[PDB]
Every structure is written in C-alpha cells, then in structure tokens.
Amino acid sequence: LDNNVVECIKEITESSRNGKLVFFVGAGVSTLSDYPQWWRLVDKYHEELYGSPKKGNYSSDEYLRIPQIFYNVKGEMAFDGILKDFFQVDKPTNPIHDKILAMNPAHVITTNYDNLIDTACRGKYFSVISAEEDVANATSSRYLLKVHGDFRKGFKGENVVLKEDDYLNYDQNYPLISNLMKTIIATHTIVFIGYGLGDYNINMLLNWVRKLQKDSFHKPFFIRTDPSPIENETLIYYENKGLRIIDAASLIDSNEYDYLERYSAVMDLLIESQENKFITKDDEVIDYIYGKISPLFALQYIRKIDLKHVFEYDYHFEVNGTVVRHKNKGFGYMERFFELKESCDERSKLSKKQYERFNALFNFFEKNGVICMAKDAGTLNTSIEINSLAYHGKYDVMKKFIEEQSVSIEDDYKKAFFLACLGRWEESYDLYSNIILNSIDESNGCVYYLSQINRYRIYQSITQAVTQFNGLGLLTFGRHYKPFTDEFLARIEREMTNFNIDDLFNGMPFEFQKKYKILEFLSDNQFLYDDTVKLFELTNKVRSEMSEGSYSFGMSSDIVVLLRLYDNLRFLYENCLWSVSFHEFHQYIRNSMSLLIEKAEYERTRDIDELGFSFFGKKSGFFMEYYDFVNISRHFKIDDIKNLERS
Amino acid sequence: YDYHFEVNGTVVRHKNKGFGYMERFFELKESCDERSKLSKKQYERFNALFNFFEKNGVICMAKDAGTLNTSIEINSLAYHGKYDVMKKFIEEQSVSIEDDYKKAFFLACLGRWEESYDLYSNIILNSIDESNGCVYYLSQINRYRIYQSITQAVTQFNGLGLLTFGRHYKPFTDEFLARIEREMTNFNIDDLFNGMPFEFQKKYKILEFLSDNQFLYDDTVKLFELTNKVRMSSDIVVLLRLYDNLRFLYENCLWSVSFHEFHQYIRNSMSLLIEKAEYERTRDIDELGFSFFGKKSGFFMEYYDFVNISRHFKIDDIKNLERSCSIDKIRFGEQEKIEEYLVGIAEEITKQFSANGMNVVFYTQFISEAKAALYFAKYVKLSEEGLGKIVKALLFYFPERDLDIGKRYVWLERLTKCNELPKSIISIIDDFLVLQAEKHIQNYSEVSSNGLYSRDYGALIKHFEKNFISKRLSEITLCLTQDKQKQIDFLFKLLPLLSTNAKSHLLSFKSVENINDLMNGIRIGLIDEFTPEHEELIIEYLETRKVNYSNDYMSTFGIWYFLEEINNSKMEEFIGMDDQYDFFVDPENFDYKKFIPSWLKNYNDKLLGKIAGNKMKHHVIEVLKERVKNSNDKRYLEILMNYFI
Amino acid sequence: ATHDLVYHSKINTFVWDVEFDIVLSDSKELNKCYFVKCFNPYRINGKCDFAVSSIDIFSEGKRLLIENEFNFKITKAVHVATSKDVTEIVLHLSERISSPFPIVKEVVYLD
C-alpha cells in the first residue's frame, strides 16, 4: 500500500489505543440501512406544494428552501405530519455500525436524527445529547453527540434542524452543542465517515478550522467512498486545507452501484491493522524495540519475570535467561534481534543512529542477563553481584558519603536511601520532601514516583515504630523515652492526612502510565504475588521428593527459587527502595533460604551415586558464599536458626 | 478508612478525626429508649440498617466484646451441589432480573455455557436503564469470564490431543463459535468501570477489584504468617478470611470462583493451616508431655472444610497432605451432613452415567470433585444404606476411562478402613465379580494401571469373611467348557470362592506337568498344597541346575523352605551356587561377609516378621546399623523401626 | 539424555523413559517393550507370596503373560525422546546393582 496510507493507519491505531479517537458519522452510513433519505422528503414536499415534480430544479439550496416554503405556506401541522409519515418506521442495524463500534471510540459525533447508531449500543453505555438542557445533565463522561436533534422527544419539526430557518439560526439556538463539538474536535483525534466532499457540514467545519493557527491543531482524517477515484488536484487542494484524505475506490476495485464493500474493506483493514506491527526490515524492528525499552534506562536493574508485562505476554522470559514465544502471532522480532546479535556482519545493515541504538540495547540486555532463546541455549552459567553499599553494611562509608555535598537529583535520592537505612528517619523524610519539591523540572517523572512511594513507606514506618515502642518500653527498655518530637509528628499527620496510595498511579500522566507499566506493582503487595505462589508450589514438590527418597541426577529444581530470590533482592537493593524494610519480604527470604538449605542437606548424602552411579551424576553440590550468609544474617531470627540447626 | 472491621465482628476507630458516628449508631442499637426520637422515616432507615448489619455479622466494638460465635452459613445451592434442585429451578419462568441472573449463574455452573452466554446477553440488553447498574456491571464481568473460559476450554480441550474420545462430541458448534469473536473483537475489561456513570463510580467503588486480572494477592501474601516458627492467633483469622471470601464469591453468583487462581489460593491456605496445626501439636507434645492435651489436635474440621478440600484439591495434593500432615490423629466434625453430601454426589454420578447426558464441559469439572471426595471419605464413618449406595455407585456406574480396576480397588479398600464389611456391600462386590466374569465371555482383556486386578477383591473378601461360597459363579463355571481359555484363567484367578463341585470341575483342569507349569500355578496360588510329586519335581529341577554347573528362580524355593512349606531336608546338599540359597537353607554356616542388605528392601511384611523372630538377628541388625550410620535412608530406618527393635 | 533418569531408593531401582528390545532364549524374538513396577507393602495374601513389589512387562501397550522369564540377554535400549541408542548405559549399569530389574519405566507407590 501507499506509504502515506500506512502512516495514517498507524496514527489512527495509536490514537485508538491511547483512547483518544472520535468518529464523525455522516448520513451515508444511515442510508446503508435503507433509511429514507432527505431527497425523498423534499420530493414529497414539492409534490404536495405544487402538484407535479421536476428533476432539473434541484440544487444544494433548494433542499433547504423547499421545506421552508412548505412550512411558511401550509403551516406546522403538515410538516410534522409528513415527517411522521416518512419517519415512523424502524429499520435494522448495519454491520458498519458494529465495525465502527468495535474500534473503541471515546466519543461518537453524528449529524443524523436517527436511532440506528443508538440501538447499536452490543452492550456499550453512551450518554445521548440532542437538546440544550441535556448537556448539563449528562450522567457519564462518554458522549454520543447527535448534533441535529434526534426524534427521541417526539416527531415534531421543532426538535430537528432541517429547514433553512433552523440552519441560519443554528449558532444562536445551539451554542453549547456547537461549543462542545468544537472542543471535542480540538482535543481528540477525529475521523470522518460516510460524508461527501461537497457536503455543507464539511465545508462549515473547514471554514471554522481556517480561523485557527497553523500548528495549533491536528489534521482530521477523512474517508472517501465514491465510485470515481479521487483526482490529484482535488486531493492536493483538500490536503492543503488541513484534512487528510483516505480513498476507498483507489485501494479496492468495485462497480459503480456498490457501497457496502468499500466501507467494509476500509473498516476491516482498520480493525485488522491494530494488532499488527508493521515491521519488515531490521531498522523497524530495532526502532520498535528501542521505543519499548528505552524508558527503562532510568532504572539500574529490572527483573526478568515482569519483563513479559512490557511486551504484553508476547514472550515468556524464563528466569534462567532464556525467552520463549508465547502469543506473538506477528513477526518474531525477538528472533530477528537474536539473529542480529549472533552475526556481526548484519550490524552494518543499519544506519548510525540505529547501530548505536542496537549497541545500547546489547548493553542493557547483557546487564539484565538475557542471553538467547531456549533452542540456542547451551551450558550458560550466571553469577550474581550487588552494587549497593547498603546491602554490604559498610556503615562508615555511607556516613562519609552522607557527609559529602550533593551534586544531582539521583545523588540526592541515593543519599536519602542511605540515610534512611542509617535510622535517621526524620532527616530521611525531610530530604525526600526536598527532593519531591525540587524535582519539578523533570522529563520522565520516575524519580518523583519512587520518592513519593518511599516517603509514604517512611511515614508508615515512623507511625508503626512510635506506636510499637510504648508496648515494649516498660520491660526491655525501662527508660521509656520516645525518640521523637510532637511537632514533627503533628506536621507529619497534617501533611499525609489525604495522600491516597491506591490511586497515585492513576493520577500520573498518560505517558508514564504507558511506558512505566511495571512500576505500578510497587504501590502494593502485588509485586510479591507472582513469586510467592511459585515458591509455595515448588515447596510442595521438593518435600514430596524428599519423603519418597528420590535422587534426581539432573538440574536441581531449587535453582529457580534461588535465582528468583537473588533477582528480587537485586531489584530491591539497586534501585534504592524502602520496601526492603518490610516484614513480608523478610518472611519470603527466610522461607526461600530455609528451603534451599533443607534441599542441600538432603542431597548432601547419597547411597547409589557413590557406588553405583559414580561414573556420572557428579554435578550435585551447594556452595555457601558470602551472599547467602548476609541474607541469612539479615532476615532470620534466633529461633529460626535454632530450628534449622535442629533439622 | 475511618474504621477497621475485625473479622470476629468488631469495629475499631483508626483514621476518623470527626464525630464518632459508628459509636453513636451502635449506642442507638444497644439502648431501646432512644427510639421514637426520630421523625418516623429515620426509624425505618434505622430498622433497615440494623437488619443489614445483623445479616452481615457486625455486632459491637472491641471494648464491648461478649465472645464471638463466628458461625459460618452459606445459603447458595451451587455450593452444596444440590444439582437436581437447581436443574428444576432453572425450568420455571423468571419473575425479576435478579432471578435471571441467578438462573444464568446456575446454567454456567451446570456446564450449559451457550445458554448462560445467551442469558447474560439478554440481561445486559434488558437492564441498561434504572439506577441498578450493579446487575449490569456484574453481568458484563460474568459474560467476559464465560467467554474467556469458553475460549480456554476450546483451546486446551478441543485439539491438542485427547485419548478419552476420538472426537470431542462437538464442544460448541462452529455456529455458536466464531460469533463470540465477532462480538468480542476488541473487548477491553480495564476500562469497563471508568465508562460507568459518575454515581456508579461514587457508590460501588468496592466492586472495582472485580475487573482486575488478579484480585487475591493480599491474602496470598498474608498467608506467610502461618509459617513462623516463633513460640486471637493467625490461624483463626486466616480461616475466617477464607470463609468470608468464599461466601462473598458464592452468594453473589460470580463465575470467577471457577478459575485457577482461586483454587490455588484455597489449596495453599488449607495446606498451610494443616501444616501449622501439625507443627504446633508436635512441638506441644515434644516440649511438655505426651498425653496431657488429650492426643487430639486443635484443628477441629467440619462440613465446609471437607467441601473445600473435596472441591479444590487434586489427588496428588491430597496425597502430599496425607503423607506430610497425617490426618488420622485429628477427628472430623459433622457426619450426617457429610454423609448426605456423599450420597448426593453418588446419586449425581449414577444419574450422569445412566442418562448418558454427559456434558463434557460439566463432566470434566465434576469428575475431579467426585474422585477427591471419594478418596477423602476414608476418614468419615457412614451408615449402612449410604455405604451401600456409594459402593454401588463407585463399582458400577463410575466411568471406566478415569478409574481402572486397581484404582477402584484402592478407593474401596480406603473406604472400609473404619467401617468394616457387612453383608450388603459384600453382596454388591459379588454382583461385580459375577458381572466382570460375564463381561469376560471375545478378545477382551482387563486393563489396569497399578497392576491390580479383580482377584484382589476376592482376596479381600476372603480376608474379611473366610466362610463364603458364591452360588452364581459356581453355576457359571459348572457349565464352563474347555473351548474358552481366557475366562477359565479368570476362574483360576478366583479359585477359593467356588463350591466343592465347582472346585473339582476346575481342579480337573489343573494339571502340573513341568517345573515352569508349577511356577505358573504358584504365581496365582492354584496349588496351595505341596504333594510329594511336586517335591520330586523340585528335586529334579535342583539336580539339573546343579549338574549344569541370568535370572533368579532358586529364591522362591529358598523362601518356601525357610517358611516351612517344604518339610524335607533335601536341598541342604545344594550349596556353592548363590549366596541367598545358602542363607535361607543353612543359616548357621552362611558367610555373612557376602551379605548385602539390598535384599531387605524386597522383603514383604510376613517374611520380615519371620526373620525378626529367628535367632541371625544381631548380624543383620549390625550391618543395617552400619548402613544407616553411613547413609540416612528411610527404608532401613523403618525396617529397624518397626520390626527388629 | 541422562537428565531424565531418577534413582528411587524406596525400592532401589531407576526410572527413565526408555524402550527395551529384549530377546528371549530359545531363539524367541520380542519387539519393543517396557517394564512397570508397583510397590505394595500392605499385601493381603500369604504362604506362597515371597515378594513385596509387582513387576509387569508391557509390549506395544498390551499385556503379555509370562511363561518362562529367563531373557537375560540385554536389549536394544533406545531413548524414545529422539531415538538415541542408550543400550550401553543399561548394559553397564545393570550388573552394578543387585536388583533383577535395574530399569523400570514408571513406578507406582501404594503406601
């Protein structure tokens, strides 16, 4: 297809996915369902007025003048009588209505006075506005704007806009509806349908648009469905007027008198194109992957388990470092990326910017630990490491760091986290508040969200500690001195009296809600749900293998748990989050380490591998390194270690 | 967040900085003179509020606690499995919208998913007006869940392989299918709530979580409090939380109760609760005393716990729970309602088998519950008629594609652990054995999974009643001729249940003519006696083997002589060929250095008891002590555990 | 291909997806078949019984009666996953253990 058509379809798909798509339904769509047209009504009026009709005398202004003459001469009763005679019948819905509703439009603007679009919503709730009083009394935030006053209240001629008198005083009689339509056009992305290029409404819209600034609005999309393909001069002239035309007869060949097929072809292409990604060459795939991944560059480390949420369940990212296709119906972009990785010659097939983007993607993916696909996987081995002084507990080093002078916002974030781990929670809250206030100048906002989460967690911890101290202060302390000031607590209570953590993510800009989708899990216990359940299941397996006396000579099933454990720790200790100070995390770490130690002890002793299977099955072994000792010391109690030593 | 409602039924003030309205309301509820202080309509409002609060089990504050009953009652027919009642209730013409909602939920539960989808579409069409948008929202959610379940069932079930049938009995035709995809081409469930009227979003905020993919993360995370090893508690509050979630999800007729996440949550919670109870019991007996607490665990289990275990647990999970968290030392609660549940499910399965109306979508869901319930019924004691009914249902009308003869035998043996065998179910087993005998008349051979067959049943019968003779099988085998070969083998497999005349009729066919023929006869134990002719045959076999000087055959005769089955000292002269032969022929002169305790792993209970009572004892006890001190194996530990000390 | 095998110490054998082309004595050829073991310590019968576990041989998926079980001439063992000759593994793992049936396809526990 044409490049410009592809670009227009891509923009329409993006607008629909973002929820900013509105449809301007014309009168041809209603005609498709054999609804009576206006020329039939004007012919009936002409027959009633004079006595005989004539085809020659029928222009654009005649359609608006003849009903006006009929109203002025015959009166009002006859006008509504004819309208009721020709408009009382009811007609079935059209497949085009269902196709256009399946595109998920935010609002629907129509200039019809019918109910076919109304009855098409299938199970969707839309607020109908057709009079002036209905604008204020809307029940929802989704608008079905019938501009010309449908027949809901009756069949009288005063509720519609048909004659020349109603057209002339339209702006005076209907200010709110016109203003609402204008602002809806201004904000959302609007696609016309079922309209002739010479229609009165389109010309009025173009005339109004010409008053605006050059770059203060987006160009509305138009769909043309006529038997004759559009001429070059007309297309250029209408494009220069600020309206982007998509032709239908040009794409699909059909006869003169067929109308449903062009509409259906265009709408089917629009519906199919949304889930399809138009990537064919290496440049497009690399650009798409960069667009998906680059927002994650702000964070130091990302865990592999939730990476599948970025790609919308299109690829299962195994914990060990392999990826598996799950629901990628379209092109296998991961396959192409790994093929580009495995061959250095094809790296010359991209431009310099694409080459540097590929280099950055290589750096990021190697840092996160993604290696290759399951088929290409061999005997890969992965080590672990942590780059935070807080984890290692070098307290003098962090004290010296906090003595240093701040140089940037991220450095202040690191200082705040390090100081919070130092127990000086008042200064930690003060520094977090200063960071939030000073982070107004930003381009991403991730630091703001993380600092707000940390501030809320610190407030909760302070409240819990001040409540809990009095309980044990009588016996294990005796002194009963609260290390806090009432002024600080009062200010804390006043400041956090209305901060709702549930809807903090919903209030963030749409860009943040689209890019940083995973970070939502940090607002609650959800980010611990995807791991804990797995652990439980694995436990129910391992003990089942322990009581039956079975010795598997292959890979040990506990490895997954270990990897996940370390993964979580890294993601919670390299991004400087306060969630590492909770109780659920401590319990989870204790359970994981206990299961690992029990499995290692059980597999330490063997019967047949020593004498019968000594020629193979040697890979069994459990090193206990510095990280395991740190994890045990941090997240264990005396009784738990006593139970471990007993068992 | 002004008040926190503790699940025992109490309220506490945490984050309210204004007037204590809840305290005033409960003060009005307490006293009676405060009435007539309201302008009529407020009295009606207070009456309605009091009724609603009493229905939901909210009573007083924390300071006014007067002990809590915490009785849990679920009044939904779908939970108790009263399938006939709901099937009858579906037929009657509806009156109100909520009646159609309940009918649609019942249809979805029963497996008629096309009718449920149509009913949900009709409901969402009709109930678009009014201020009762809650029904519209719930119907939307249920319709989406039904569509997801239909697609998942088609993808996993339709295609992808199935050995139960050649074709899937058309799980929804291609007319009903490929139409939902048109109606749900780009359906999005995340924006369903946001598109609602602002009054709906203001009022029914608490329903928002129904539109999320995962809505049970908080309880799963909070389950971690049950694995603490540190010495109301946590188990009680966890149990009421589970009960509350179950009641809310079932009473409101929500389909999300039939998904994987809910089943996983129930399994995890129940398993953790049982493990914690067992650990607490074992620590209590370890640290204080043996029988001070009445040798009874504190986890008294009742109707609802049994229902949840039967419905939400697979066979493997129940097996793991039994293996690691032995239940025989904790008693059951209600028995009449459990027996009613068991007889009802037996009636349901017999109706499903008899009427041939096997809805595959419903059958797949129902058979797992049936299997789990019949497996777990071992710990419950039942009446005579109920036991007979369930035994008849399990043996007769249970589908063959799921339980073979061996699995059915395992289920039956587990059933009669604490109920024994009266005459009625013995006669039922006889009707099965004769029925099997008939099915035998042909190119038909029985297929089993664990390697157990019909003869085991007879053995069990002969174990529980040694003076039984079946007239029907005797008459069947009396007219039996020698043209057939497989059926006569079946009768030899069931030899001891036949009358004397039938015994002679079959014994004539028995003809020892070769040592391998003797082996074949003794595998099924046809020749229980040891005639001198058989002894001479064994003598010549051993002589040929000795003069001849792979597999092992001498072991059987070694066991037989060590079991005093051979009352003749003849084979003592055959030594020097293999170790165990001399071990079980000459225990005094056997060289114990060549001994390997691996043989102890293939010795049954009777042989182990026999060798335990013979003095040989200290040599084997020493070598197995060395084995256990070298490697900590459970088999040697158990062998020392129950027999040799 | 050695990752799938598992050693069971309750009955002291091995479980591994494998298929046996055993040959019976007296020039009797048997096609591909596999072993099945069941562990049942709670037996009912007495006197004549001398074992605790039941061993069956399944041929092409249908049971076969045993008349003379003395086919101690190895087998053309193949790992049916990708059709790998693992006969060497079986033959030099058999004599290292005293179990008459070192390799069993699946085992079943009836404890």
PDB file of N, CA and C in Angstrom, chain A residues 516-544:
ATOM      1  N   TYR A 516       5.996   3.232  31.886  1.00  0.00           N
ATOM      2  CA  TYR A 516       6.360   2.568  33.138  1.00  0.00           C
ATOM      3  C   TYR A 516       5.152   1.811  33.691  1.00  0.00           C
ATOM      4  N   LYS A 517       4.795   0.739  32.982  1.00  0.00           N
ATOM      5  CA  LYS A 517       3.650  -0.068  33.392  1.00  0.00           C
ATOM      6  C   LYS A 517       3.987  -0.941  34.595  1.00  0.00           C
ATOM      7  N   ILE A 518       5.213  -1.468  34.648  1.00  0.00           N
ATOM      8  CA  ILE A 518       5.577  -2.406  35.706  1.00  0.00           C
ATOM      9  C   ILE A 518       5.625  -1.721  37.069  1.00  0.00           C
ATOM     10  N   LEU A 519       6.012  -0.443  37.113  1.00  0.00           N
ATOM     11  CA  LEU A 519       6.217   0.236  38.388  1.00  0.00           C
ATOM     12  C   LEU A 519       4.949   0.307  39.227  1.00  0.00           C
ATOM     13  N   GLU A 520       3.776   0.141  38.609  1.00  0.00           N
ATOM     14  CA  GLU A 520       2.531   0.097  39.368  1.00  0.00           C
ATOM     15  C   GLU A 520       2.585  -0.972  40.451  1.00  0.00           C
ATOM     16  N   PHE A 521       3.234  -2.102  40.158  1.00  0.00           N
ATOM     17  CA  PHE A 521       3.315  -3.187  41.129  1.00  0.00           C
ATOM     18  C   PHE A 521       4.030  -2.768  42.405  1.00  0.00           C
ATOM     19  N   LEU A 522       4.810  -1.686  42.364  1.00  0.00           N
ATOM     20  CA  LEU A 522       5.498  -1.216  43.558  1.00  0.00           C
ATOM     21  C   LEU A 522       4.569  -0.526  44.546  1.00  0.00           C
ATOM     22  N   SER A 523       3.330  -0.225  44.156  1.00  0.00           N
ATOM     23  CA  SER A 523       2.436   0.519  45.034  1.00  0.00           C
ATOM     24  C   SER A 523       1.713  -0.358  46.050  1.00  0.00           C
ATOM     25  N   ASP A 524       1.816  -1.677  45.940  1.00  0.00           N
ATOM     26  CA  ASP A 524       1.089  -2.574  46.831  1.00  0.00           C
ATOM     27  C   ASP A 524       1.895  -3.862  46.977  1.00  0.00           C
ATOM     28  N   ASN A 525       1.248  -4.911  47.481  1.00  0.00           N
ATOM     29  CA  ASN A 525       1.867  -6.221  47.637  1.00  0.00           C
ATOM     30  C   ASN A 525       1.833  -7.044  46.358  1.00  0.00           C
ATOM     31  N   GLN A 526       1.332  -6.478  45.257  1.00  0.00           N
ATOM     32  CA  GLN A 526       1.179  -7.242  44.023  1.00  0.00           C
ATOM     33  C   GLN A 526       2.520  -7.745  43.502  1.00  0.00           C
ATOM     34  N   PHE A 527       3.576  -6.939  43.636  1.00  0.00           N
ATOM     35  CA  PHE A 527       4.878  -7.320  43.102  1.00  0.00           C
ATOM     36  C   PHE A 527       5.474  -8.534  43.803  1.00  0.00           C
ATOM     37  N   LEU A 528       4.962  -8.907  44.974  1.00  0.00           N
ATOM     38  CA  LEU A 528       5.388 -10.119  45.659  1.00  0.00           C
ATOM     39  C   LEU A 528       4.480 -11.309  45.381  1.00  0.00           C
ATOM     40  N   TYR A 529       3.374 -11.109  44.661  1.00  0.00           N
ATOM     41  CA  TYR A 529       2.421 -12.190  44.438  1.00  0.00           C
ATOM     42  C   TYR A 529       2.911 -13.175  43.383  1.00  0.00           C
ATOM     43  N   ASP A 530       3.574 -12.681  42.335  1.00  0.00           N
ATOM     44  CA  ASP A 530       3.990 -13.552  41.242  1.00  0.00           C
ATOM     45  C   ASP A 530       5.105 -14.507  41.646  1.00  0.00           C
ATOM     46  N   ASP A 531       5.847 -14.194  42.706  1.00  0.00           N
ATOM     47  CA  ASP A 531       6.916 -15.065  43.177  1.00  0.00           C
ATOM     48  C   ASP A 531       6.432 -16.026  44.256  1.00  0.00           C
ATOM     49  N   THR A 532       5.774 -15.488  45.290  1.00  0.00           N
ATOM     50  CA  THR A 532       5.399 -16.282  46.454  1.00  0.00           C
ATOM     51  C   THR A 532       4.661 -17.550  46.049  1.00  0.00           C
ATOM     52  N   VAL A 533       3.637 -17.409  45.201  1.00  0.00           N
ATOM     53  CA  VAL A 533       2.847 -18.563  44.781  1.00  0.00           C
ATOM     54  C   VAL A 533       3.759 -19.637  44.209  1.00  0.00           C
ATOM     55  N   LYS A 534       4.639 -19.242  43.284  1.00  0.00           N
ATOM     56  CA  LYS A 534       5.576 -20.194  42.700  1.00  0.00           C
ATOM     57  C   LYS A 534       6.341 -20.923  43.791  1.00  0.00           C
ATOM     58  N   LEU A 535       6.914 -20.163  44.731  1.00  0.00           N
ATOM     59  CA  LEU A 535       7.662 -20.770  45.823  1.00  0.00           C
ATOM     60  C   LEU A 535       6.831 -21.844  46.505  1.00  0.00           C
ATOM     61  N   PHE A 536       5.583 -21.508  46.852  1.00  0.00           N
ATOM     62  CA  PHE A 536       4.720 -22.471  47.523  1.00  0.00           C
ATOM     63  C   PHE A 536       4.655 -23.763  46.728  1.00  0.00           C
ATOM     64  N   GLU A 537       4.340 -23.655  45.435  1.00  0.00           N
ATOM     65  CA  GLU A 537       4.229 -24.848  44.607  1.00  0.00           C
ATOM     66  C   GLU A 537       5.522 -25.644  44.651  1.00  0.00           C
ATOM     67  N   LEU A 538       6.658 -24.958  44.493  1.00  0.00           N
ATOM     68  CA  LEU A 538       7.931 -25.664  44.475  1.00  0.00           C
ATOM     69  C   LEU A 538       8.164 -26.384  45.792  1.00  0.00           C
ATOM     70  N   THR A 539       7.788 -25.752  46.907  1.00  0.00           N
ATOM     71  CA  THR A 539       7.901 -26.426  48.193  1.00  0.00           C
ATOM     72  C   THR A 539       7.111 -27.727  48.177  1.00  0.00           C
ATOM     73  N   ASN A 540       5.851 -27.661  47.735  1.00  0.00           N
ATOM     74  CA  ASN A 540       5.014 -28.853  47.696  1.00  0.00           C
ATOM     75  C   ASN A 540       5.608 -29.932  46.808  1.00  0.00           C
ATOM     76  N   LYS A 541       6.496 -29.560  45.885  1.00  0.00           N
ATOM     77  CA  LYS A 541       7.198 -30.569  45.105  1.00  0.00           C
ATOM     78  C   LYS A 541       8.383 -31.130  45.881  1.00  0.00           C
ATOM     79  N   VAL A 542       9.227 -30.246  46.422  1.00  0.00           N
ATOM     80  CA  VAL A 542      10.516 -30.684  46.957  1.00  0.00           C
ATOM     81  C   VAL A 542      10.311 -31.640  48.123  1.00  0.00           C
ATOM     82  N   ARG A 543       9.438 -31.267  49.062  1.00  0.00           N
ATOM     83  CA  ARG A 543       9.137 -32.156  50.178  1.00  0.00           C
ATOM     84  C   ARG A 543       8.577 -33.480  49.680  1.00  0.00           C
ATOM     85  N   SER A 544       7.738 -33.435  48.641  1.00  0.00           N
ATOM     86  CA  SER A 544       7.214 -34.669  48.068  1.00  0.00           C
ATOM     87  C   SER A 544       8.342 -35.549  47.548  1.00  0.00           C
TER      88      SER A 544
END
